[PDB]
């Protein structure tokens, strides 16, 4: 009708105004400003430890708070907690559903969250008087496969699923308290701000959105990619975040100014990106492609500064310790590697 | 070198490894099948014939344990989760050949037969299923033979010239399904006709699975 056409025209002219306002504040690029900083030398990393025991495909892993323990999830229906320094196994949790796609470790080291392809997120309690590991709560209410889950606190959790919606739950009650909507395609990854107040998410419609936990409604939207977004991560400062897509390109955004700061890509790489992570100081960026190896960049000049080529299949998960002592990489060949 | 509280941890890790290996040895004694279709193709009827988020079914037939996965209720983007089913023994694809006259609810122009053929083409020529066997079930043929006399088949295929009988129509549909393959060397398609009342579908599945197992065993030893 006429009202629909006039509202669409209004939306188009607001989009034009937003584009003009964004282009107004663009004065310089990061490369020009960082053109005088000395370059970091060639980085050499060696496989200090190799973790074995999984007999299927490994899909996710998460570091602990003390930078000693990590948890990993495999399609053999198993969730394994490791001991990085001594290369030992602490706990092995069976799963009712073997189609796992994500895992999360509580910051207090008390609970572990797991879910995927079953519309259910299960919480497991580690410290039990009985001596075993038991499931505490099964959150249900999603109509699509769960893509990501992160512990907001010891009692709150944030989940992102394949039904184009994000949810914030309450473990003791078992019911949703806030729902975030606005994505057209499925949502793949989310990252939490260091102050535990905001979080960004990425969707298959080549877009990222910022959300506030308290209000529960969106604030900003970032576009620029040409394919699906597979990974996302915050800067240690909290004023920027990096996104990786399937079109062989990584991008770094900013919060105060909604622009493109720098892009990372090469002519010799035509493959997608699965995981992206930062360093403790923010000078160093790591990204794991599916061409059987990882790659490393200087975050301020966009130049490769080392290759962690040690895997025989696609790299799926990558993590960095809180103290920045070592990095961990998992892949489809059922192997974890620690680099220092 | 190790203290008194590290040897116990090492022993616990060894026991965990032993139990994990023992439990993982048992998961290789299962024949995994993935069931697909076009919604109203008749999945439920076939499931209740062969049986005495994601749906899982168990059954046994002559000392063989089957593991059937139905994923029809996902209603999500398939290319984002289709790579989980890499080492599946076989795909079971159900089609109702009595829906050539009808058309889809979403679009009156597009018919269900073309949608089924397009989905079959998409699944068959994927980069993850280069050497995966496909079994094709054509169900509800009695309604098809009762309806073929009233209405011609030229509606779905305008380039058809036949006697408009049951046998020729069934053969033509079978050939049309078979012609979409693009490998013909490392991929095999098995076709069968069935109605509501039958007792011989499980035997067909058993024969196809036996052939796949023989091929895998030959390839493992290097003799193939």
């Amino acid at each position, epitope marked *: 009708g006429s009202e629909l056409d006039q509202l669409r025209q209004e939306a188009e002219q607001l989009k034009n105004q937003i584009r003009d306002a964004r282009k107004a504040c663009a004065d310089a690029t990061l490369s020009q400003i960082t053109n005088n900083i000395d370059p970091v030398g060639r980085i050499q990393m060696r496989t200090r430890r190799t973790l074995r025991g999984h007999l299927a495909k490994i899909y996710a892993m998460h570091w602990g708070t003390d930078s000693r323990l990590l948890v990993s999830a495999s399609q053999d229906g198993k969730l394994i907690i490791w001991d990085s320094y001594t290369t030992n196994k602490v706990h092995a949790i069976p799963l009712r559903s073997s189609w796992v796609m994500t895992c999360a470790y509580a910051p207090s080291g008390n609970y572990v969250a797991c879910g995927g392809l079953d519309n259910i997120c299960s919480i497991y309690n580690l410290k039990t008087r009985e001596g075993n590991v038991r499931v505490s709560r099964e959150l249900a209410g999603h109509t699509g496969y769960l893509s990501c889950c992160r512990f907001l606190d010891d009692n709150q959790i944030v989940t992102s699923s394949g039904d184009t919606t994000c949810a914030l739950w309450d473990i003791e009650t078992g019911q949703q308290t806030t729902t975030f909507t606005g994505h057209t395609g499925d949502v793949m990854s989310l990252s939490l701000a260091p102050d535990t107040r905001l979080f960004v998410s990425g969707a298959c419609d080549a877009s990222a959105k910022l959300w506030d936990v308290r209000e529960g409604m969106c604030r900003q939207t970032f576009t620029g990619h040409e394919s699906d977004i597979n990974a996302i991560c915050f800067f240690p400062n909290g004023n920027a975040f990096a996104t990786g897509s399937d079109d062989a390109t990584c991008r770094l955004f900013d919060l105060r100014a909604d622009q493109e700061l720098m892009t990372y890509s090469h002519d010799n790489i035509i493959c997608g990106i699965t995981s992206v992570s930062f360093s403790k100081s923010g000078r160093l960026l790591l990204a794991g492609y599916d061409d059987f190896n990882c790659n490393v960049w200087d975050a301020l000049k966009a130049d490769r500064a080392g290759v962690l080529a040690g895997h025989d299949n696609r790299v799926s998960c990558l993590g960095v310790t809180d103290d920045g002592m070592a990095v961990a990489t998992g892949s489809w060949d059922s192997f974890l590697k620690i680099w220092n | 070198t190790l*203290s008194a509280e590290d*040897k*116990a941890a090492v*022993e*616990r890790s060894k026991m965990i490894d032993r139990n994990l290996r023992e439990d993982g040895e048992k998961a290789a004694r299962e024949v995994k099948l993935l069931l697909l279709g076009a919604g109203e193709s008749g999945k439920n009827t076939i499931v209740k014939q062969m049986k005495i988020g994601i749906v899982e079914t168990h059954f046994t037939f002559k000392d063989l344990h089957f593991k059937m996965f139905d994923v029809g209720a996902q209603r999500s983007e398939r290319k984002k989760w289709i790579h989980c089913f890499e080492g599946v023994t076989a795909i079971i694809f159900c089609v109702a050949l009595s829906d050539y006259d009808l058309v889809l609810a979403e679009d009156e122009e597009m018919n269900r037969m073309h949608a089924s053929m397009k989905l079959f083409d998409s699944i068959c020529n994927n980069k993850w299923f280069t050497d995966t066997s496909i079994i094709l079930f054509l169900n509800k043929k009695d309604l098809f033979e009762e309806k073929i006399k009233k209405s011609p088949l030229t509606i779905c295929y305008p380039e058809y010239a036949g006697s408009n009988t049951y046998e020729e129509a069934a053969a033509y549909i079978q050939c049309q399904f078979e012609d979409l393959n693009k490998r013909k060397d490392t991929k095999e398609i098995y076709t069968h006709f069935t109605c509501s009342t039958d007792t011989k579908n499980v035997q067909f599945v058993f024969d196809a699975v036996t052939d796949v197992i023989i091929k895998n065993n030959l390839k493992d030893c290097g003799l193939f």
Partner: single-chain antibody, 231 residues
Framework: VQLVESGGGLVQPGGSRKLSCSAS????????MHWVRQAPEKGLEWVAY????????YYADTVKGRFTISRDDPKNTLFLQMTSLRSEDTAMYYC??????????????WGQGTTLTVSSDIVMTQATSSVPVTPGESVSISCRSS???????????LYWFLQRPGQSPQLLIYRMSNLASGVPDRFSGSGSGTAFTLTISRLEAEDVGVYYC?????????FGAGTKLEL
């Protein structure tokens, strides 16, 4: 969670007998078991240890060759067989759980005890034997050894626990710095090298009893003479 012990009676100076204990409320197959002996009006000492999977079995020098340990996981029962008994084997026997991984707290449950009556090593020294106290004032207890308990990995293997009158011992502090579960924050532990101190800020009527310190570097585990507190 509960452990019940039985099989303790009166025996002749020469004979044999078996003691049994049964578990209820926890996964018995994943816990190692310890036997502890406490002489009448004396201290308590370690006897034997059996591990999960029945792979490692450790005995004490004074009972080596005469005591046998056995485990039944299907039925959740621990047996101890005594084939030769002297006149010094009259005491009360307790069964203790233990779990070993990073962050575990061994010697957490002690259960009850059963009475039996018959008709190199690290020395743990506690000079203090009795201290009078009025509620509302802090108390400090000292424990010393002969060899440093600090290992190359950075851990110190010292344990502090309590025994109330007419009751089973309860764990207080493990690894000389970590507070156990179910105990108040009043208790604290510290120390370095060979010297160790346990401090109680505020004392109530439930803090009266005997205190013990233990080491866990190597077998056998050696206990210290108890430190009594009187009101």
């Amino acid at each position: 969670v509960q452990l019940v012990e039985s099989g303790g009676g009166l025996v002749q100076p020469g004979g044999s007998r078996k003691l049994s204990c049964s578990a209820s409320g926890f996964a018995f197959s994943s816990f190692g078991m310890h036997w502890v002996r406490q002489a009448p009006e004396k201290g308590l000492e370690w006897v034997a240890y059996i591990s999960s999977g029945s792979g490692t079995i450790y005995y004490a020098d004074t009972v080596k060759g005469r005591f046998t340990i056995s485990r039944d996981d299907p039925k959740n029962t621990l047996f101890l067989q005594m084939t030769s008994l002297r006149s010094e084997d009259t005491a009360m026997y307790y069964c203790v759980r233990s779990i070993y991984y990073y962050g575990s707290s061994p010697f957490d449950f002690w259960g009850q005890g059963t009475t039996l009556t018959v008709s190199s090593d690290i020395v743990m020294t506690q000079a203090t034997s009795s201290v009078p106290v009025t509620p509302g004032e802090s108390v400090s207890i000292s424990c010393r050894s002969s060899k440093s308990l600090l290992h190359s990995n950075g851990n110190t293997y010292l344990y502090w626990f309590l025994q109330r009158p007419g009751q089973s011992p309860q764990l207080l502090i493990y690894r000389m710095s970590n507070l156990a579960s179910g105990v108040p924050d009043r208790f604290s532990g510290s120390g370095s090298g060979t010297a160790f101190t346990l401090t109680i800020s505020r004392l109530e009527a439930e803090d009266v009893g005997v205190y013990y310190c233990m080491q866990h570097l190597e077998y056998p585990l050696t206990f210290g003479a108890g430190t009594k507190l009187e009101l």
